[PDB]
Design a protein around this motif. Structure first.
Motif, short mmCIF file in Angstrom:
data_model
loop_
_atom_site.label_atom_id
_atom_site.label_comp_id
_atom_site.label_asym_id
_atom_site.label_seq_id
_atom_site.Cartn_x
_atom_site.Cartn_y
_atom_site.Cartn_z
N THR A 20 0.87 -1.18 0.00
CA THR A 20 0.00 0.00 0.00
C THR A 20 0.91 1.24 0.00
O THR A 20 1.72 1.37 0.94
CB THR A 20 -0.94 0.05 1.21
OG1 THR A 20 -1.54 -1.25 1.29
CG2 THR A 20 -1.96 1.14 1.05
N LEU A 21 0.76 2.08 -1.00
CA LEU A 21 1.59 3.30 -1.17
C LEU A 21 0.98 4.48 -0.45
O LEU A 21 -0.24 4.50 -0.08
CB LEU A 21 1.78 3.61 -2.66
CG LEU A 21 2.36 2.45 -3.47
CD1 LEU A 21 2.25 2.79 -4.94
CD2 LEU A 21 3.81 2.14 -3.06
N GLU A 22 1.79 5.52 -0.30
CA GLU A 22 1.39 6.73 0.44
C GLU A 22 0.16 7.39 -0.21
O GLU A 22 -0.67 7.99 0.56
CB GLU A 22 2.61 7.66 0.54
CG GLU A 22 2.27 8.93 1.27
CD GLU A 22 3.42 9.84 1.58
OE1 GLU A 22 4.58 9.53 1.11
OE2 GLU A 22 3.18 10.80 2.34
N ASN A 23 -0.01 7.35 -1.53
CA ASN A 23 -1.12 8.06 -2.23
C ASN A 23 -2.38 7.17 -2.24
O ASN A 23 -3.35 7.59 -2.87
CB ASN A 23 -0.79 8.52 -3.66
CG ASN A 23 -0.50 7.41 -4.64
OD1 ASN A 23 -0.70 6.23 -4.34
ND2 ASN A 23 -0.02 7.80 -5.82
N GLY A 24 -2.33 5.99 -1.62
CA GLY A 24 -3.47 5.06 -1.51
C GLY A 24 -3.50 4.01 -2.62
O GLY A 24 -4.31 3.06 -2.48
N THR A 25 -2.70 4.12 -3.67
CA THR A 25 -2.61 3.06 -4.72
C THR A 25 -1.99 1.81 -4.09
O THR A 25 -0.99 1.93 -3.30
CB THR A 25 -1.84 3.58 -5.93
OG1 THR A 25 -2.56 4.69 -6.45
CG2 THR A 25 -1.71 2.53 -7.02
N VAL A 26 -2.53 0.62 -4.38
CA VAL A 26 -1.88 -0.66 -4.00
C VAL A 26 -1.07 -1.16 -5.19
O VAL A 26 -1.60 -1.24 -6.33
CB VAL A 26 -2.87 -1.72 -3.49
CG1 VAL A 26 -2.19 -3.07 -3.32
CG2 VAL A 26 -3.50 -1.29 -2.17
#
Lengths: 374, 366
Positions: A20-26
């Motif tokens: 899970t990335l900081e911008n919410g993209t998995v």
């Protein structure tokens, strides 16, 4: 269960799963490439995380060959009695998330079987820390004695210290700032624009087409290389001298021009344009203060002992930025100046001075690890 | 009779005929665009030559109007009671040889009726000085009271002073060095490479095709603009702030990035890529020492009174270069330090301080 470290000097591919990335993209099914030098202590207390810069990779030290086009980017730094003394430390380096030398990046295959390319998510420095933390956790490592890095690796080291202070004993933060500056974002975004201008960019989906925006990345790299140089040294070295017997008055090259062309070419033989874009954008995102009440609050509440190195002639991460880190981090005893004419590239070329900062950082980490019980 | 001066504020086109350039190429049928402010004195002795920089033109002063989409690049510098007081002085500015605003350059037609393009010769700063001197001579002017310029305009002024000390009474050399440095050549040659990489360059022969390498020039201009800025001021103004409501974490722009894209676009609407290339190569050629036993010999040879100005925060022509000029030019009384946060662009932004150095220069010319 936990995966074993690769054999010394060899590439290990660590599969960490979805991130899970900081911008919410998995980002699904991530792999992080790892190299290590030195034995892991039974108590796993002796890990030194070596964090590479924009065009670096996991190959910190050792000769060219066996899949490596050149000697390690910090060749000599790790070995018996070396600044990272592998008789005591386990020096681990990853290929950063977004990279092109074994880790998941834009050249890697997405779940649909095609390269990520334009589908590769925006990543931050914090995402790069999170991927390296996961790779370590998959290797059974939850604590690090020290993080060490210059340039983009200094941004990674600084985020690691601020984000996980309970899980690092000391750090070296060399030739970076607390956040990207307007000038850094300006050059980085314009380097990216030079790549995206290249008609072979194909919107970022050039991977596997037989065409690639090498020409635009060569332009980007020539501009970046100037940002890495000390102005006075560059003039002392080349001045306005012509290249060999060429005549600039009738269209020939200057020596510094030929040199920059050569630097561009060297990168095009070893490095992916899409990776250049992704990592340049991650450098523009650098901001230890984001979501933490700003840079001053974030650094003042970070208790980790830290060696802050800054290079006198640095034009890309000017020494005011390292003076600011050294003032705000309470665990910094004072700025360590690298007195060098070689500009930002001093973080790579001043092996003796940088090695002394590393050794000081690790002598500190060893003292703290003796008093750290886990 | 001589070629008449244009009416105040109008462009005059001065045809100087063929020019033998420094590299031996003869450039035929050259035209130099001229603007002037103030009366020429009866003795023709009151001319102040205003030498523009890389993207400047003859439009030194005045508002946006017919034939000039923006205000003068040194707006207010010349006029009644101004630093170049046109009640006493005749301010003259050319469009430089190689330019795109009235003077012969790559976009101009060659003898064969097609744009010069890839056939345009490599010109030097010395060739630019020769074209200006020839245009002045056609107007009946064989000496000038002063030469003033910043940046590339400073290189033109310095070469004028060193080449023709008998024919100028004083100079302002602002924000330049005695020769191109490795860093300047590095950024100049890479800016040119960005233009030539653009598939619309068409080898330099894009003029009249309906396609132009504006994208590559916009890249070149974004990098050049950073060289013109003071690092600290740029961070104070923009930091890492986003552009308006954009989110850089999901692919939006930063404010500094948006500002650079805007600067590129502005130049693309007013300036020719081929001129950018020719003038960038002229800057890389800059060397007052060439053929004269080197920079120190050439500067020491020049006895003209000279105001040398350098900007403390200049990243493109760092102040060590103007300290060198001040130390070696015997007519310089000391480096005039322009203590400014605005980088190289200080030579354009610091109108009051640049005006003060111009008044000092015109005092020396008397």
């Amino acid at each position: 269960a936990t995966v074993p470290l690769p054999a010394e000097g060899e590439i290990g591919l660590v599969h960490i799963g979805a991130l899970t990335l900081e911008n919410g993209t998995v980002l699904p099914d991530v792999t992080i490439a790892v190299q290590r030098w030195g034995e892991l202590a039974p108590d796993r207390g002796n890990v030194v995380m070596v964090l590479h810069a924009l065009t670096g990779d996991s190959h910190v030290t050792g000769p060219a060959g066996d899949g490596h086009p050149t000697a390690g980017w910090w060749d000599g730094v790790a070995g018996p009695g070396a600044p990272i003394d592998t008789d005591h430390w386990c020096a681990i380096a990853t290929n950063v998330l977004g990279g092109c030398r074994g880790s998941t990046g834009p050249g890697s295959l997405a779940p649909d079987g095609k390269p990520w390319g334009s589908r590769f998510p925006q990543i931050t420095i914090r995402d790069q820390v999170a991927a390296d933390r996961a790779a370590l956790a998959a290797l059974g490592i939850t604590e690090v004695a020290a993080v060490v890095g210059g340039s983009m690796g200094g941004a990674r080291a600084l985020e690691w210290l601020v984000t996980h202070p309970d899980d690092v004993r000391a750090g070296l933060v060399l030739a970076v700032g607390a956040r990207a500056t307007a000038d850094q974002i300006g050059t980085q975004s314009t380097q990216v624009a030079a790549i995206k201008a290249d008609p072979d960019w194909q919107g970022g989906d050039y991977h596997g087409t037989g065409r690639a925006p090498t020409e635009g990345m060569e332009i980007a790299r020539r501009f970046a290389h100037l940002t890495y140089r000390g102005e006075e040294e560059l003039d002392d070295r080349f001045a306005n001298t012509p290249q060999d017997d060429e005549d600039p008055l009738t269209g020939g090259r200057y020596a510094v021009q030929s040199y920059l062309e050569y630097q561009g070419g060297k990168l095009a033989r070893r490095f992916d344009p899409g990776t250049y874009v992704v990592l340049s954008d991650a450098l523009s995102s650098h901001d230890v203060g984001r979501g933490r009440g700003g840079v001053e609050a974030a650094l003042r509440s970070c208790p980790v002992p830290v060696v802050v190195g800054g290079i006198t002639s640095d034009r890309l991460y000017p020494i005011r930025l390292q003076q600011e880190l050294a003032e705000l981090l309470p665990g910094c005893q004072g700025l360590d100046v690298v007195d060098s004419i070689y500009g930002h590239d001093g973080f790579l070329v001043e092996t003796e001075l940088v090695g002394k900062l590393i050794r000081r950082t690790l002598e500190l980490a060893q003292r703290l690890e003796h008093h750290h019980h886990h």
